[PDB]
Amino acid sequence: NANPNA
């Protein structure tokens, strides 16, 4: 559950 956003 890391950063899935740009």
Partner: antibody, heavy 123, light 107 residues
């Protein structure tokens, strides 16, 4: 504002396949990862899958791993979920959801949920 | 597989009451806990993330507290719009939801 429109749900016999879609608007869809989460009266809320904003990383729950495939079309701003080998217990309301914006080292979850589409797996 | 448990399952309450609900995880999830509100026949809505951060647009009468394995959600003064089902969710390792707490109209 943000709007999510699910489609593709319905009644399907066990063992067949089905493709769900989620149309996103009100934000840059290609900049955010998405979740599929299902809800049934027997199991409550149950996370299904997650996909990165660019599709590079995908994760699935153990109960659905190997059967569901999540994908996306950033040119069409459309999220897809191909579900194969459906079982009876997969009957639920399925929501797509948008991951919130946070810091680089924080953990992430969803802030905006879709409208939901009902899937009934029965013979 | 992290087990989640919410208490109480059902709480009979009245408008203006002080409400406190608890949520426990099978293992330590640090502070990575979110609270979501869902009304019947309606989509779920985000209330709190990081166990104590209020989502933008959420009234100040809602507050979160807790860390590790024990978490609480407090409503200082209940309002009729707050009659809904409240779920806690760990997001430290994948995502698992509790059974849900339904706020019932006491009469």
């Amino acid at each position: 504002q943000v709007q999510l429109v699910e489609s593709g749900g319905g009644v399907v016999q066990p063992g067949r396949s089905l493709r769900l879609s989620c149309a996103a608007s009100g934000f840059t869809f290609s900049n955010f990862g998405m979740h599929w989460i299902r809800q049934s009266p027997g199991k409550g809320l149950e996370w299904v899958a997650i996909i990165w904003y660019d599709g590079s990383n995908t994760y699935y729950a153990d109960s659905v791993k190997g059967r569901f495939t999540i994908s996306r079309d950033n040119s069409k701003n459309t999220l897809y979920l191909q579900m194969n080998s459906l079982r009876a217990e997969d009957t639920a309301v399925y929501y797509c959801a948008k991951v919130w914006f946070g810091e680089s080292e924080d953990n992430y979850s969803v802030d905006v949920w879709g409208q939901g589409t009902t899937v009934t797996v029965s013979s | 597989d992290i087990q989640m448990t919410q208490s109480p399952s059902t709480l009979s309450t009245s408008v203006g009451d002080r409400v406190t609900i608890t949520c426990r995880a099978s293992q330590s999830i640090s502070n990575w806990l979110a609270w979501y509100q869902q009304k019947p026949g309606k989509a779920p809505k985000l209330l709190i993330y990081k166990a104590s951060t209020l989502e933008s647009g959420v009234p100040s009468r809602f507050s979160g507290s807790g860390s590790g394995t024990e978490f609480t959600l407090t409503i200082s003064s209940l309002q009729p719009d707050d009659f809904a089902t409240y779920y806690c969710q760990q997001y430290s390792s994948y995502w698992t939801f509790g059974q849900g707490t339904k706020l019932e109209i006491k009469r």
